[model samples]
Target chain A: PERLQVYKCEVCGNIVEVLNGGIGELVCCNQDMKLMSENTVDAAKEKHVPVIEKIDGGYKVKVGAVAHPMEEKHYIQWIELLADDKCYTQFLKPGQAPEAVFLIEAAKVVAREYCNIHGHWKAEN
Target chain B: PERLQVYKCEVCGNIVEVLNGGIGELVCCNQDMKLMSENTVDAAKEKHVPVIEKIDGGYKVKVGAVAHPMEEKHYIQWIELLADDKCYTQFLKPGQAPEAVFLIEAAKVVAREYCNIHGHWKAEN
Candidate 1:
């Protein structure tokens, strides 16, 4: 069984996450929602990548090495962190940095970021 | 084959809606989401009731007659409007009013609101 998986509805741009494991298929708008693909680390497309950093309290998740744009029409909606079998999500607003910190006890964690325009991105440390 | 329906994850506070119709059961956190019930109009709990108004452009949806609280711990997360077989969602942050306006060409519509603490509420007109 997988630890985490993400799905998105293309018609309405709704996002859903399966934390524990896949619980069958997710449907929306009278159709099956599409699963988001994890984008590979691209040095140029850093703004679409998720970066993870270890912190004192827990772990910090940042989008891109230089931070992504957070505009009204196009912005990072939220950041998710999965660690120690727990899922944490932090919603973001326009003009705010696409980052979040998850307080969990784990040596490593999986980080995922959802962009309003760019879809989803994930990283493993 | 319902026109509008809302479902929410018990574990995480994630919300989902079936606009066109229910394709199937919605799964989240390894469990089927529990459908929200329509609360009877209670003048006392106006904050939990949805108020709809006709406007120039289209329609306006409000959480309460006096507006609901928008605090960090107890705030409205988003407002959804389903009209003309289309679904529109507006994400809200703390301090913002728990209301949203949708521009659609429908005489009657369904309005749904998701509170960070109170789960979901809806109004059919």
Candidate 2:
């Protein structure tokens, strides 16, 4: 119905995205997973906030105005998109580009990215 | 990387899809989440297997030749697609159609579905 809802386990760093509708509480490690807030301005916008651009077949989502750092200690965890619908996700690592290409047709899209330390950021285009 | 590896917690019914390349072992409930095998011939293929079709802008994935039950007791929890890449997912609930539409372009597509009672099934299109 709405964009994909994400939840994180505080007890453990387990993350889960809502793929199905209401299925009761998302329990992890014997406790409930906390819902994450998206699009908050992080400490560094250049590395945390998501940026979008129209590409040949789909949309390309990158992190911030400047490229995000991809080091061993800190790195992006995932890049997800709600392209005119509530779907699409891609995970990244430290030694990869800080961007994702979602090959879906859409008039509008919401780009969301998560950092190991920076939490969540979003951009609508 | 390799068709989005899926992991499920045996102690608790928690399931997780691998988005990042490698993040060590997926731990939950003080144990590692078990990796689920896709495309396994379930007990009832006609009720659990996914069937994909080419649509206008995307592909429509339906659950098997026969419609799966969508009731409070049992239902298809989610439908996911790997269309030439590792991406696309939709969550479902009770009292809904056992199908999903993914708007993406690809030469080859893999359709996967999860039933709360029977577990995971897959089909290629």
Candidate 3:
């Protein structure tokens, strides 16, 4: 509700919208996850996992991820990003391969309800 | 309850029934988690965390977890389990494939009862 844009997850087929509003916001969010996902997020979930409202490049971001799979142990990885409503795809792996689709229209509806309850997107510029 | 008979953690789904019955006892609980949740769990706890009596081909398994959400640090990537279960079946990955679902029948309850303070699941000759 902090003014997030809706987007779909290409890998997990999930819809998401991050909080705050900006292309830069999404970048920052992904950066924050860089360490958590261990630089690569292609192998960390039981399935395509979805995260919401993560701040990436100033854009509200969501990621589909999993973990390393082995080596005594490892954590989950926030891998792949879904498609965008604007025909844009924000991926963290950058250029690996297209794996799946992200559904995020409902996320927009959800975000709207959330924004109504927690205020709207505040402008910075 | 040392008669576990459910195996399916390709990664995560929400079904498990491990009661201590085989596959080398899930490789001795992933080396006892190696070091709590910090050894590798990935980034840190924020979401997606699952663990239930794992004992690989000695079967009776279960996994599907998440944590370590950011750079403040890490933990959680019981990653690539859904697919790596048969491979990891326990951590210490050897191959690189598959990705999801280990849903078992039921989780052996810890119940904070200390095994009823009277009984314990015992084995060994």
Candidate 4:
């Protein structure tokens, strides 16, 4: 891989990120995990897209302006900030807010969020 | 959602780990990022399969009894300890050792690893 890459176990939702390239195949649960898609886009609902705003030390990512559900069954799972050479992610619990603040400063920042239902979404700043 | 889960972005090699379950779908590159499997088993080799041993107050996992290569293009990407309540990952550079030491004590410890060439692998202790 040219840069960081993501691979997932389709059977159990296991995820792996690779920072380098190799010729070996990644296997899980006796199967090969599939590669995730790139820079994703979805509708502009407060429920799916990410809101990336600059803050004092880094950036804050709110899953949605309307705020997403944070129930035992449905919630915003995590928020991530991908920079040119680094990646930062914050995992959220069911009772927490659907937002994360990353302590990073990158000219190229890609913000991402995952909902229990709506899936992965991204925004660039 | 009952326990920790993993997801990935196919378009880029972005890896995400979620500590909570949600009802929203995980999307990457405009597509859904699938759930990964658990307790995966892969053939034993110096290039894959982790060897875990107990240290003073933690655990040490070497990618293989034999050393794995660490080249600019081919190397171990990361090592992780996935426990019931939390997960810890150690990212490696091209010249770093193909192993990681996690300062955690758990009744159940799932050791996971990834190679730039080979994909996903895990072992339990």
Rank list by TM-score: 2, 4, 1, 3
Note the Cα lDDT for every prediction shown: 0.65, 0.73, 0.22, 0.65
Can you write out model 3's per-residue Cα lDDT over B1-125, one digit (the tens) per residue?
Answer: 12212222122211122211222221111221011211232422213223334443222222223321322222221221222111112111123121222222223321100010111111111
Give the winner by DockQ: 2
Q: What TM-score does chain B alone reach in each candidate, compared with the true chain B?
A: 0.77, 0.88, 0.19, 0.78
Cα deviation at A33, candidate 4, in Å, is 2.6
lDDT tens readout by residue for model 1, B1-125: 23345566676555544422334556555667677666632333578667889887578889977688999898877776666434555667788777876555668887777665676677778
A95, model 4: CA deviation in Å?
A: 1.1
lDDT per residue as tens, model 2, B17-65: 6443333355556666566786663568888888889998779999978
DockQ of each: 0.04, 0.22, 0.02, 0.08
Q: How accurate is candidate 1 locally (lDDT)?
A: 0.65
Scored against the true structure, residue B124 in model 1 reaches a CA lDDT of 72
Query: Model 2 misses residue A96 by how many Å?
Result: 8.5
Candidate 1 residue pairs in backbone clash:
none
Q: Backbone clash tally for model 4?
A: 39
- TM-score of the first chain alone, every candidate: 0.82, 0.86, 0.20, 0.78
Local error of candidate 4 at residue B108 (angstroms) = 21
lDDT of 1 by residue, A1-125 (tens): 13345666666555554422333456555567776677742434689778899987578888978789999998877776665434455667798777876545678778878776677688889
lDDT of 3: 0.22
Tell me the lDDT of model 1 at B6: 59
